[PDB]
Ligand binder design. Sequence first.
Ligand code: 9T6
Length: 283
Amino acid sequence: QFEERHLKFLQQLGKGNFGSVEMCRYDPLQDNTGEVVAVKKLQSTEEHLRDFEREIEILKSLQHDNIVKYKGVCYSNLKLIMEYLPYGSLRDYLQAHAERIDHIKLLQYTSQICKGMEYLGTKRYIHRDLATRNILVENENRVKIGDFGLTKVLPQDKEYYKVKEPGESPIFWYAPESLTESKFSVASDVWSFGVVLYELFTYIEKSKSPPAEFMRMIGNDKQGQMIVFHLIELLKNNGRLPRPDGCPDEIYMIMTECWNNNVNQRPSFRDLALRVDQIRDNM
Ligand SMILES: NC(=O)c1cnc2[nH]ccc2c1N[C@@H]1[C@@H]2C[C@@H]3C[C@H]1C[C@@](O)(C3)C2
């Protein structure tokens, strides 16, 4: 329902899981007016096309404040049309404005990521790619989960979805049962949320990121697909990301409790939202 000839290229925004996202002016009157939007397209196999159409449907089915807004599609090679958010990714915003973002603000974002995820759960959706690079900023007070490219629907009958053909993955955000048995759940999204909260309290220092930090603990000399093996074994032996500099005990406990080897012990997003809110209301 969006006409290709009316989408005017302004600039690239970045590359996602498969395809890429552009900033365009939608100008169907062909005057000067018309909103700016974000346009996703594939760089395109059949397997990817199937997934992209699933992604569109997932995004269409979501209405939440903490989820990026679907606007429409563009047929002629599919295009997904979304709201454009001018502050960009949380990782970029945080790096740009690090000096005016205090711990309270960080827990406000944390709280909003929890709400959006709690909402994902009610629809039995598994995000699988929770990371600050995937969170967008709407304004200094509101963030939105974007990129639903790897998101899966739980079948009506099972509490986990096994992912056939695991391509090159965000391995440092993955729960152990995801790395071993390709098993994805509300519990694995909770683990990843734990890494997101870790990212926030490091303020995305380069050397403090989850990849830099696990490679430290494995050894920079280790290589290839050995990396994944050493990571699985490290996690089995209760090796964990360190407490970020300036991160209080109470906050670290949320992270370590999210990073439980036992799937059933990991807290719920309902618990995480409430717990975060109180620590926030404790300052
Ligand atoms: N609504 C959007 O998709 C969107 C809106 N405004 C934006 N401003 C900068 C990126 C961006 C958007 N998507 C970006 C795209 C996909 C994914 C999430 C974003 C950052 C990323 O690195 C990874 C590239």
